[PDB]
Design a protein around this ligand. Structure first.
Ligand SMILES: CCN(CC)CCOc1ccc(Nc2ncc3cc(-c4c(Cl)cccc4Cl)c(=O)n(C)c3n2)cc1
Ligand SMILES: [Cl-]
Ligand SMILES: [Cl-]
Length: 261
């Protein structure tokens, strides 16, 4: 078994439809990795093409400081194993839940930092003519010890020039993608990033549909209980503009003074 030969398993850190994710130490280098272990997808299934999008996204991208690093993938014993960088801070979804548990929150400066850093990850992905298509808090990961945010799960990554769109979570989905308009996909990532920051900011749980859903896609920003400066707030609001061309590109985002300050 390559998995057991190369690695010692420390604890399960995720599970779901499939499979599990384990925190492991690699024996040769003594470093900690996250390894996703699952039953090998049925040939031709959605789960397989997700795994395919992921491997081939990595082949294009290689490494970036705001993208969760993909080291290796292999299959053995009717399982698929995917080795990633371990982010010791968990996902942004975890951190938001923990904030509610203990009644903490992200200060405005910390929210801007989140926005800027994920923006930097999108800038790189977009510059390679890819789009992520599943930005949301559970796919943003956190490395600490001083904090780095990284984009995880490239399973929905597709090409701008020949997009195959597996829709993401309807809570974070821009209206034009739902309308099967795939001509501005980088701006769907920007949209979802705005709502991701809004979630991080303490907003009520986002609607999956209904009037509240549609109101959001009209460019109306959900209520945020923290007082944010008006400049920060207006930047979030423009990121969910109904006209995607009025949303900033990631390039424009990471040069924004409100964020760099
Ligand atoms: C620490 C105790 N707890 C309570 C929250 C259990 C879960 O806590 C976590 C601690 C750290 C992480 N970090 C982490 N770091 C990297 C990955 C990478 C993948 C990943 C992805 Cl997104 C795609 C393909 C392959 C992999 Cl390994 C992953 O699924 N998870 C959960 C990942 N998780 C998480 C929870
Ligand atoms: Cl098993
Ligand atoms: Cl641009």
């Amino acid at each position: 078994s390559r998995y057991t030969t190369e690695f010692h398993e420390l604890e399960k850190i995720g599970s779901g439809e499939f499979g599990s994710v384990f925190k492991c130490v690699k024996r040769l280098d003594g470093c900690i990795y996250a390894i996703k272990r699952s039953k090998k997808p049925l040939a031709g299934s959605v789960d397989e093409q997700n795994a395919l999008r992921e491997v081939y996204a990595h082949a294009v991208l290689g490494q970036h400081s705001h993208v969760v690093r993909y080291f290796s993938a292999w299959a053995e014993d009717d399982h698929m194993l995917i080795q990633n960088e371990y982010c010791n801070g968990g996902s942004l979804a975890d951190a938001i839940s923990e904030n509610y548990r203990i009644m903490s929150y992200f200060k405005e400066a910390e929210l801007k930092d989140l926005l800027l850093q994920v923006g930097r990850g999108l800038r790189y992905i977009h510059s390679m003519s890819l789009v992520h298509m599943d930005i949301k808090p559970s796919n943003i990961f956190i490395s600490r010890t001083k904090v780095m945010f990284k984009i995880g799960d490239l399973g929905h990554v597709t090409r701008i020039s020949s997009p195959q769109v597996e829709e993401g979570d309807s809570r974070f989905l821009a209206n034009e993608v739902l309308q099967e308009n795939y001509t501005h996909l980088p701006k769907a990532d920007i949209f979802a990033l705005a709502l991701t920051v809004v979630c991080a900011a303490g907003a009520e749980p986002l609607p999956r549909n209904g009037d509240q859903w549609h109101e959001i896609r009209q460019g109306r920003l959900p209520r945020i209980p923290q007082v944010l400066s008006q400049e920060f707030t207006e930047l979030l609001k423009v990121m969910i503009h109904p006209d995607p061309e009025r949303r900033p590109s990631a390039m424009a985002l990471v040069k924004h003074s409100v964020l760099l300050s």
